[PDB]
């Protein structure tokens, strides 16, 4: 109530821009993305502008309550709605301006990737490297890393972040950039969730590609040996360097299929001239190759595609991540043991997928320690996702847990990272911060401690301050 | 007896190619570089060629004895003469030849840097980046990394080593390169000390620069703030990215002087043109700028100068290192305490010196994962030498340790790299390993277990196999 009364004041009266757990729509406003890890925030507030985020944050500090902003909602732990914390919903901070001269656009955190793409296209045929899912909010994406079709070509979205507006724990409003509050700006570019609320983004852009070529080779068949041949091929090609740099290169494995897919930027001619499927021992069953000029159509198509697969909507699920680089590639034996594992473990899923997103090229162009993002030298990501038509059961966890154990069990005591966009709230808090942040974890405790000594910005796997 | 007989065999009966501790020659054959960390190896063997290294190594292996090769001898611990281990003195492996066509040279490990410099110039006016001191042996140099005048313009020494010949701890003789036993080639170029004896190098060469421009600026005086000013201008001048690529940039500090050393590759007008001195506050008490057209003369004065410096000789001494970078660029507050500490701490020396030396330039055309050399994103090193009239005492140990700290008070807990060419045997071992190799400590620990499971090539701080 002391808290409930100024939180009304932060949003200048508007009773429809603030909401408390006693009401009945509260379950539905909290809008959980993971259907199993339901959370009850202490309140929810929809600030209008930056002073209102500053105000709301003090409201929580005055009543010893911790804070997590929610932009787009896609955190698998639902940390945007951390229970008994203030949930600052940024859906109104959706501003977008473009500079026809620098081509540096200026967006608010509540912009969802779909609207960032439509606007950067319409306002001067621009785009920027980012993820494929159009419902990903920008606030939580530019700040964790943001990889996608154009990443091997151009890098992480956060490489194109030039300046941010940060609201701090003590409610100050600062800017940050490579020239001004360097350290803060280091943490906001990979770990913003733990140091402040980013309420506006200066993001450089690229010009869109003239010809985007999607491609989708398939192999049906539940035979481990054939599947490990596909994988080992893909992994070995990638580790080749025979591949083009400006070519995205995914590989998704379901129960019953292997899906080499990706996008090449350049003419459909030259792609086929790479005869990409030749390099594989067995030929694929199906071959979808499409060439888009309109780049927003390429983007919305691929956003649509992941949604239709069933791995992009709020659901009952659990998922984990892994980073593999040159030193840590998966052995020939290990592969076989893997797909062997997949075929024969009860998994408990109405649908599962395992994605191998390639991740070299322009991503390597930035120092491991220049951003909070640590995995610059990574060769490919591994995201594992287990949907269940029922509630999640401890069956499905062990399936995915074991899937990580086997995937690394070709070198199990080495260093494997995790993407902090694909949080995994089913693992020891100590193990998490290590995979997420790796060696940057300590500099991050240095900064955390200095711009948020209490833990005002806190979640299950937030960065905790020094001792 | 068994061991001694086999070992006379390995050198084909030349009984003056084997030295045992019972002989009066012995103490001196060991030829200790540090006079405090003395040592007694359980034999010294002087092989003529590869076949005799390989046979020498098995003699040790068959008597459950461990092995270290000696080349130049510049290991501050005296690791080539480790106590109770076999010392494989490579003095007789000074083979040289230059292919005019490729200007690639094929040397043996015994070649000191002096002889290497000379023989390259003379056979086609070639050189190859390396340490300034001429008494350093190629053997334990091109394997730890090897940096001197032309590194920020051409790279480390090991960035020119093409192929190698290696005696593996099972006495097999194998070659290595980027496209052959690559897992080995990696470890040879960073911590050969740990994985084999190299008995032949294939180094590419550059042609010699037509004009070299040694220079120096001296700030006599003991005022610590006055000096600290000197340095913090020096730290700030390097980080500006203002300086040329083809130009080294030292800065040494003693009990009363701040010598700003370096070279420059080009004409004299220009180096003065640049007015290196200008950027500084108090102008320098003294200046020299000699121009060497002849490069060997240039290298040979440089080497010879370090000798007269007093540091680069066998002696009673102790000495340590630290790497630094944009992120731990020492702060102004502590930088003062440094010189106040230098000026105030009972240093127990008769001569002390603290060498900051630039890096980057081209040192960063090679990923830290591409050689066993991991501190490749460094801005500058620090070598702290501290000599003593007669035996070393705790007083002097502690002085450099304390100094080591008072440098680190900047961010006392950040990752501070040590340099493996400047070893430090008065710190705990876990401490060392992480300093020398860091990120790669693991990957080397793989390769070490593949090609030396029984840890035949061991020194007080050598890479170990996994557990
Ligand atoms: C009191 O508080 C409430 C909430 O804080 C205030 O109401 C909020 O603000 C506006 C006012 O109605 C609402 O606007 C959004 O919702 C509409 C209905 O769903 C959308 O149609 C609308 O979109 C259109 O206009 C935008 C231009 O501003 C444009 O960006 C839109 O594209 C959007 O499309 C979808 C919508 O499904 C969205 O997911 C996309 O990401 C994209 O942004 C489209 O052209 C607005 O997006 C807002 O919903 C509403 N929030 C509530 C009620 O919770 C109310 O005004 C305050 N009273 C005051 C201040 O006095
Ligand atoms: C809300 O929290 C914010 C985060 O905690 C607070 O902001 C931080 O405030 C501190 C203190 O104001 C800032 O620290 C520095 O402050 C000044 C500014 O120096 C800076 O700019 C210089 C050049 O422009 C650079 O050379 C510096 O490296 C630095 O970037 C400095 O004078 C300070 O140094 C002094 O610090 C103490 C005494 O203050 C001494 O021990 C030192 O020896 C030295 O004399 C600090 O380095 C910090 O920049 C700032 N950070 C951000 C992100 O805003 C904010 O105060 C707080 N708001 C409240 C409480 O209302
Ligand atoms: C279906 C799906 C597909 C995805 N695909 C990709 C992909 O291809 N590539 C990729 O890189 N990632 C991908 N992601 C992951 C996404 O990048 C991250 O999960 C990110 O955390 C989601 O951002 P959000 O704002 O939408 O989520 P949220 O839950 O709102 O935010 C996630 C975290 O960021 C914090 N945060 C939110 N807004 C701010 C802000 N303004 N300032 C500071 N902290 C803030 C929150 O507090 C929370 O801790 C995908 C996620 C999903 C659900
Ligand atoms: C005065 C001085 C100046 C220096 N200046 C520089 C400089 O400017 N730049 C720079 O980069 N370094 C410099 N060094 C460092 C030098 O590279 C290292 O100290 C190096 O380890 C010593 O080489 P060494 O072969 O002469 O001595 P050693 O003690 O014989 O060898 C050093 C280590 O390598 C091992 N080793 C030797 N030969 C072989 C071989 N053939 N195969 C495998 N392992 C082997 C030895 O076992 C030992 O542990 C300097 C050293 C000194 C003493
Ligand atoms: C390993 O994982 C794979 C993929 O998850 C499993 O095989 C797949 O999982 C399910 C096996 O039970 C099958 O699930 C769905 O089948 C049909 C659609 O094809 C679907 O209608 C079923 O749902 C209902 O029967 O649907 C109704 C109406 O929608 C609801 O009342 C409720 O959802 C019902 O339960 C069922 O959800 C799936 O078809 C199947 N596909 C393939 C290609 O294998 C393996 O079983 C897993 N291995 C294990 C568990 O050992
Ligand atoms: C048996 O003993 C030795 C085996 O290692 C070896 O002696 C070495 O001989 C080399 C060259 O013959 C000498 O090298 C150099 O000596 C002076 C010193 O200033 C240099 O200026 C010269 O250029 C010369 O090349 C070494 O002094 C010597 N080393 C040792 C340890 O004795 C013998 O050649 C071996 N003899 C046989 C028959 O095998
Ligand atoms: C801090 O370091 C200074 C240099 O590292 C040191 O000054 C040096 O002091 C020694 C001995 O006090 C002098 O050496 C003298 O001793 C030798 C030994 O035989 C004799 O031949 C001579 O008497 C010789 O001069 C050095 O000359 C002197 N060097 C310099 C540059 O000052 C300080 O003593 C140290 N401060 C302390 C320990 O508080
Ligand atoms: C002495 O030790 C040597 C290293 O420990 C060892 O050489 C190693 O031999 C293995 C076995 O072939 C090689 O490993 C790989 O060789 C090829 C190339 O990938 C594959 O076909 C194999 O299945 C295996 O994965 C190593 O490359 C090789 N190491 C080096 C440095 O050449 C010798 O065999 C040992 N000699 C003895 C015991 O007499
Ligand atoms: C491609 C990706 O990078 C990616 C894909 C999925 C399915 C996901 O869940 C996440 C977090 C991702 O980052
Ligand atoms: C320019 C690079 C110089 C060095 O690397 C270097 C310098 C000194 C004084 C030293 O003692 C040692 C061991 C070194 O390696
Ligand atoms: C949520 O409930 C409050 C009152 O409990 C109501 O005023 C508000 O309009 C509701 N949200 C809607 C209808 O979206
Ligand atoms: C592409 O590769 C296929 C499969 O290996 C093979 O038929 C041929 O080399 C290429 N196809 C063409 C040229 O039509
Ligand atoms: C030292 O060892 C023996 C005995 O002193 C002697 O014959 C030999 O020639 C000497 N060799 C060296 C290198 O001093
Ligand atoms: C460098 O700057 C000084 C500043 O007084 C000036 O006198 C001098 O002429 C400039 N050029 C050279 C080559 O010293």
Author numbering:
A (entry chain A), B (entry chain B): 5 to 471
The publication says:
Sorbicillinoids are yellow secondary metabolites synthesized through an elegant combination of enzymatic and spontaneous biochemical processes. The flavin-dependent monooxygenase SorC and oxidase SorD are crucial in this interplay, enabling the generation of a diverse array of functionally complex sorbicillinoids. SorA and SorB work in tandem to synthesize the hexaketide precursor sorbicillin, while SorC and SorD are involved in the subsequent oxidative processes, including dimerization and oxidation reactions.11,12 Specifically, the monooxygenase SorC catalyzes the oxidative dearomatization of sorbicillin to form (S)-sorbicillinol. The oxidase SorD can then use hydrated sorbicillinol and oxidize it to oxosorbicillinol.
We also obtained the structure of SorD with sorbicillin bound at 3.0 Å. Even though sorbicillin is not the actual substrate — it lacks the hydroxyl group installed by SorC at the C5 position and the additional hydroxyl group from spontaneous water addition at the C6 position — it does mimic hydrated sorbicillinol and binds on the si-face near the N5 locus of FAD in both monomers present in the asymmetric units. Binding analysis using microscale thermophoresis also showed that SorD could bind to sorbicillin with a KD of 1.2 ± 1.6 μM. The electron density was most pronounced in chain B and gave an indication of the preferred binding manner, where the alkyl chain points toward a smaller side pocket lined by hydrophobic residues Ala151, Ala153, Ala252, Ala361, Leu363, Phe385, and Tyr423. Residue Phe387, located on the si-face of FAD, is important in sandwiching the sorbicillin ring between its own aromatic side-chain and the isoalloxazine ring of FAD by π–π stacking interactions. Other polar residues present on the si-face of the FAD in SorD include Tyr80, Asn426, Asp254, and Thr359. The C4–OH of sorbicillin can bond with Tyr80, and its C2–OH can bond with the pyrimidine-2,4-dione part of the FAD. The critical observation is that the C6 carbon of bound sorbicillin is in perfect alignment with flavin N5, should hydrated sorbicillinol be placed in the same position. In this binding orientation and assuming an anti-addition, the 6-hydrogen would point toward the flavin N5 atom for hydride transfer, whereas the 6-OH group would be oriented toward Asp254 and Thr359. The former two residues might function, directly or indirectly through water-mediated interactions, as a catalytic base that promotes alcohol oxidation.
